């Protein structure tokens, strides 16, 4: 149930395809569209546990470059209403003097 169009809390849209080998590929939202790549556990447990996954987006496309990248780590939860629960790290490229403030942390919840 991972393959699909997902939306987070701020109307961002993630279109993902989950290959049977464990690959995740797709798009993050024209000038605002970006490539995404990740991996997921293609053989989760069955004690009712979520499926672990993750992905990465570099905020560079042919229209802009913000010099940074975000990784989302979390799990897909199946049920009457499917969701993906994640936490994320965004890192910006900095000078070494500035490295201490290069990384933001947050959380996102996605729904179809």
- Which residue is associated with the tokens 């109307």? 11
State the minimum distance, in angstroms, from the CB of residue 45 to a second copy: 5
Candidate list 2, 13, 27, 85; residue touching a second copy; CB under 8 A:
85
Output the CA angle 27-29-35, nearest 5 degrees.
Answer: 30
Token pair in block for residue 5: 């169009």
Q: What span, in angstroms and rounded, lies between the C-alpha atoms of 35 and 47?
A: 34
Candidate list 3, 29, 67, 112; residue touching a second copy; CB under 8 A:
67
Site string for a second copy, 30-49 (x = CB under 8 A): -----xxxxxxxxxxx-xxx
Instruction: Write out the residues near a second copy by the rule CB under 8 A.
Output: 10, 21-24, 35-45, 47-60, 65, 67-75, 77, 85-96, 99-107
């Amino acid at each position: 149930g991972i393959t699909g169009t997902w939306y987070n809390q701020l109307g961002s849209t993630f279109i993902v395809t989950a290959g049977a080998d464990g690959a995740l590929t797709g798009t993050y939202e024209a000038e605002s569209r970006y490539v995404l790549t990740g991996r997921y556990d293609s053989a989760p447990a069955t004690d009712g546990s979520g499926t672990a996954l993750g992905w990465t987006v570099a905020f560079k496309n042919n229209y802009r470059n913000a010099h940074s990248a975000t990784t989302w780590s979390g799990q897909y939860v199946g049920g009457a209403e499917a969701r993906i629960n994640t936490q994320w790290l965004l890192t910006s490229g900095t000078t070494e003097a500035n490295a201490w403030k290069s990384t933001l942390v947050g959380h996102d919840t996605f729904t179809k």
